[PDB]
Every structure is written in structure tokens, then in C-alpha cells.
Design a protein around this ligand. Structure first.
Ligand SMILES: Cc1cc2nc3c(=O)[nH]c(=O)nc-3n(C[C@H](O)[C@H](O)[C@H](O)COP(=O)(O)O)c2cc1C
Length: 147
């Protein structure tokens, strides 16, 4: 299984999560690509991958507003070629705000709708990967059993 990990991150918190996930999924024996949303193109992005792990921060309090680099890709999710592919979502957020890790349910709902198989419940963490290393590790463990 060739995994793509796609992240949108403004201060580096979801990026640290993406990086820890790359390390752990690769360690499990998978070919893994790390891609920042800033340099990604939605059109047929999932071609050649068996699983896509996507995640980003939310920025709109009362409304859901996704991370700037990720939001155009989210809007063009229909073009990625996700039908039949496995998917899991992750996010860094802050519980003081409304829509805590709101990108996770939003990506899961949109992905299901396009024929992707969402492999497990998305990771929701406050702060960066070293603030909650065990939740990151358990989620990676969940994806590895499903790949
Ligand atoms: C104006 C503003 C709005 C925010 N809105 C949300 C939000 O709706 N949900 C959430 O979980 N966090 C929200 N946050 C918190 C950030 O998502 C949090 O700092 C996150 O860890 C940043 O992750 P990143 O560095 O990967 O972009 C907001 C922050 C700011 C400044």
C-alpha cells in the first residue's frame, strides 16, 4: 500500500502530526509520500495511491473555514479520484474555539459521499504531535491494521 499524506498547516501543528504519521506508517512497511497542500493539485491527486490520509486546521470559529492551503483542495475533492480508495482524516485544533477540529467530520462526510472508504474515525488533537503522542500512535496503529 502506497499512502499519500496531505496536510494544510499555518503554524506547523497539523504538519507535525503529518510528519509523525509518515514515520509510523512507513515503519509499518508502506511506501509513503508527504505532501503539503500548498504545493498540491486536486486533479487526480489520489492516482497511484491506495490510501490518502488528509488533515488540516480550522480557522472560522462560528463557521467552518479550512486552512488556506487546504480549502481549495477540499472544494475540488470530487476531482481527486478517491472512489474506492481508503481514507482517514486528522487535525490539530484548539478546544477554546467553536468547530473543534471541524475539518475531520467535514472531510469524512465529503469523502464518503465520493466513494472513498474512511478507514477509521479521524484523529483530533490540540496543539502539535508532541502534546499528545499516544493518541497519534494509536491512530497510526488503527490505520496500519486497516491498510
Ligand atoms: C482566528 C482563528 C480561528 C480559529 N478557529 C478554530 C476552529 O474553528 N476550530 C479549531 O479547532 N481551532 C481553531 N483555531 C485554532 C487553530 O486551528 C489551532 O491553533 C491549530 O492548532 C493550528 O494548527 P496548524 O498550525 O496546523 O494550522 C483558530 C484560530 C485562530 C486564530
Amino acid at each position: 500500500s502506497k499512502v499519500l499524506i496531505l496536510f494544510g498547516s499555518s503554524t506547523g501543528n497539523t504538519e507535525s502530526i503529518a510528519q509523525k504519521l509518515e514515520e509510523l506508517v512507513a515503519a509499518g512497511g508502506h511506501e509513503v509520500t508527504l505532501l503539503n497542500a500548498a504545493e498540491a493539485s486536486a486533479d487526480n491527486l489520489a492516482d497511484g495511491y491506495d490510501a490518502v490520509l488528509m488533515g488540516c486546521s480550522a480557522w472560522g470559529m462560528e463557521d467552518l473555514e479550512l486552512q488556506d492551503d487546504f480549502a481549495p483542495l477540499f472544494d475540488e475533492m470530487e476531482n481527486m479520484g478517491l472512489k474506492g480508495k481508503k481514507l482517514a482524516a486528522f487535525a490539530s485544533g484548539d478546544m477554546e474555539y467553536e468547530h473543534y477540529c471541524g475539518a475531520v467530520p467535514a472531510i469524512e462526510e465529503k469523502a464518503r459521499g465520493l466513494g472513498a472508504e474512511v478507514i477509521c474515525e479521524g484523529l483530533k488533537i490540540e496543539g502539535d504531535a508532541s502534546s499528545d503522542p499516544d493518541a497519534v500512535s494509536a491512530f497510526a496503529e488503527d490505520v496500519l491494521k486497516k491498510l
